[PDB]
């Protein structure tokens, strides 16, 4: 996240982090239920083996800590292709269920498409620098408005599908970035997006492009039920 | 199919054949609907590119011929592993829907588990020789009884899961074989199995092992709905 702030305690209970073999974070995730995590399909090929980490170390407000989970089944949307980065969505099934608490809870699937102007909360452990590499020690948060499809399409001519939507600032300075992929975009209490891609990070007229979760509610629900 | 007979005209309307780059058949399939085909997950790695062929050339009884379809989406059961060959099931989505007729129709999913002793019809274009390679010019058919789980487990100690069942003859001589994988096992009008694996072909005390479709009704239905 570029130009964000240190998330306040208990602000993103549904946040998950994918960690590689070297115990390093490379992508985000969203808790959907005790066994399921939502992330980006493109994160699946950015590492051979990985686990999922949820929770936090702020025991002052609530005890429990961070919990690392092993992934039992990886279910990538079969229509994903890096040619367009369309269908950049995947569902993970953990070996052991997550023990929920007030600061570790699932996100709500959307019941209506995202509305232009609506404020959303984007979070992640990804790069905080427009140019260069500066990763945070604390989870980052960013409040950004949903952009009209017209401005989105105008930003990425012919590269925006119906399964994508833009969130951010046309003037640049604040956006998600590398490592944030898979992370949540929560607008008014609903999970409206998954961090996906963009031209650079926080560039002028180059807002972050997100997977429109509303278009995948049926795929997520049935995929989980097919494997449950 | 070893020790079978030339299927009679219109006997297996739901039969599908997977063909590789060289236009050669390497696996079977079952028509489930106009856009979906059921086959074995292990067939997916036996060829890079492939298409699906349905229909027949017996225009005497009905016109239409054979139709070759391109595969749009391949949906393999994510729990499949060649370590056990458990979850040997996959669903294919065609680019163009199949034009049904009396001799080209979908199979019925099961509503009850397979019963011991029940007669089933197994079909395929696979090898017809116990030892050696002798492929048929015509679709082969085989009528075989469902074996008790006890005899099945006794045939393959510790290798039979709850998602598998045996069909065939303990004395050998008649069984499915290489190339038949993915093909249908229809008992009393219901699709009860998918050709999967076995120790050799038509060997004594080594009956064919099939994917128990009844255990996957939920996975098939929801997977199709998740992608439809
Ligand atoms: C995997 C995710 O961490 C990451 C998120 C980037 C978010 N960026 C902004 N500005 N909000 N996604 C990616 O790295 C994706 C997947 C791989 C390629 N990709 C991109 O974002 C490319 N930079 C997009 C691209 C633009 C022009 C030409 C080729 C690719
Ligand atoms: C892919 C299918 O055409 C084919 C069907 C064989 C059916 N045989 C009988 N007797 N009904 N399946 C296979 O070839 C599968 C998948 C790959 C391995 N395999 C086997 O059947 C092996 N021969 C099973 C095996 C036995 C002992 C040790 C290792 C493997």
Instruction: Determine contact, residues A119/A186, Cβ cutoff 8 Å.
Output: no
Query: What distance in Å separates residue B228's CA from the closest CA in chain A?
Result: 8
CA dihedral of A214, A76, B106, B86, whole degrees rounded to 10? -140
Judge whether A106 and B103 are in contact, CB under 8 Å.
no
How far are the Cα atoms of A4, B1, B2, B130, B131 from residue B134, in angstroms, in the given order? 68, 10, 10, 9, 9
B123 tagged catalytic:
no
| Experimental approach taken | X-ray
CA distance B152 to B146: 10
Determine the 3-state secondary structure of A162 from DSSP.
coil
CATH node for B13-106+215-228: 2.40.10.10
Taking contacts as CB-CB distances below 8 angstroms, the residues of chain B near A86 are none
Per CB-CB distance under 8 Å, the chain B contacts of A218 are 225-226
Asked whether this chain's domains B1-12+107-214 and B13-106+215-228 adopt the same fold, the reply is: yes
Catalytic residue list of A: 181
Distance of CA B16 to the CA centre of its chain: 9
Q: Which of residues 99-138 of B touch A (CB under 8 A)?
A: none
Q: Which residues of B touch A71 (CB under 8 A)?
A: none
- The shortest C-alpha distance from A221 to chain B (Å) reads 7
Whether B222 and chain A come into contact, CB under 8 Å, resolves to yes
Q: How many CB atoms lie within 10 A of CB B105?
A: 14
Concatenated DSSP letters of A168-215: S-TT-S-B--TT-TT-EEEETTEEEEEEEE-SSSSBTTB-EEEEEGGG
* Contact between residue B37 and residue B29 where contact means Cβ atoms under 8 Å apart: yes
Report chain A's terminal Cα–Cα distance, integer Å: 34
Interface test with B, best of A218, A226, A228 (most B CBs within 10 A): A226
- Give strand pairing partners of A191: A186
Supply φ then ψ for residue A106, to 5 degrees.
Answer: -70, 160
Torsion of CA B132, B135, B141, B147, to 10 degrees: 30
Residue of B130, B181, B196, B228 with catalytic role: B181
Q: What secondary structure does DSSP assign to B126-194, as a single string?
A: S---SSS----SS-EEEEEEBPPHHHHHHHSTTT--TTEEEES-TT-S-B--TT-TT-EEEETTEEEEE
Task: Tell which one of B197, B199, B205, B209 to mutate to probe ligand 2, the residue whose CB is within 8 A of the most ligand atoms.
Answer: B197
Please report the sign of the dihedral spanned by the C-alpha atoms of residue B65, residue B71, residue B72, residue B75.
Answer: positive
CB atoms within 10 A of CB B187: 20
Kindly state the helix (H) or strand (E) to which residue A217 belongs, with its residue range: helix A217-226
> Which residues does ligand 1 sit against, CB inside 6 Å?
A 27, 40, 42-43, 85, 126, 175-181, 195, 197-199, 201, 208
User: How far apart are the CA of A199 and the centre of ligand 1, in A?
Assistant: 6
Q: Structural domain boundaries of chain A?
A: 1-12+107-214, 13-106+215-228
How would you list the strands of the sheet with B119-124, edge to edge? B5-6, B140-145, B119-124, B184-187, B190-197, B208-212, B164-167
A79 interface with B at CB cutoff 8 Å: yes
Residue of B nearest to A216 (CA): B226
B46 vs A43: CA distance, rounded Å:
27
Phi, psi for residue B27 in degrees, rounded to 5: -160, 160
| Crossing angle (nearest 10°) for helices A217-226 and B217-226 | 170
Residue A34 backbone phi and psi in degrees, to 5? -60, -30
Q: Domain A1-12+107-214 is in which class? A: mainly beta
Q: What residue in A sits closest to B74 (Cα-Cα)? A: A78
């Amino acid at each position: 996240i570029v130009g964000g702030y240190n998330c306040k305690d208990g602000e993103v209970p549904w946040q998950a982090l994918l960690i590689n073999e070297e115990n390093e974070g490379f992508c985000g995730g969203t808790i959907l239920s005790e066994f399921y995590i939502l992330t980006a399909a493109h994160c699946l090929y950015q590492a051979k083996r990985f686990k999922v980490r949820v929770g936090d170390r702020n025991t002052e407000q609530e005890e429990g800590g961070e919990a690392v989970h092993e992934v039992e089944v990886v279910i990538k949307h079969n229509r994903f292709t890096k040619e367009t980065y369309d269908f950049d969505i995947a569902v993970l099934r953990l070996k052991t269920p997550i023990t929920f608490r007030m600061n570790v809870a699932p996100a709500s699937l959307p019941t209506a498409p995202p509305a232009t102007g609506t404020k959303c909360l984007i979070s992640g452990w990804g790069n905080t620098a427009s140019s260069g590499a500066d990763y945070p020690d604390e989870l980052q948060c960013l409040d950004a408005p949903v952009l009209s499809q017209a401005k989105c399409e105008a930003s990425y001519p012919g590269k925006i599908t119906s399964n994508m939507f833009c969130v951010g600032f046309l003037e640049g300075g604040k956006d998600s970035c590398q490592g944030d992929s898979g992370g949540p975009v929560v607008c008014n209490g609903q999970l409206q997006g998954v961090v996906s891609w963009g031209d650079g990070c926080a560039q002028k007229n180059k807002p972050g492009v997100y997977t429109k979760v509303y278009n995948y509610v049926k795929w997520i629900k049935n995929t989980i039920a097919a494997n449950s």
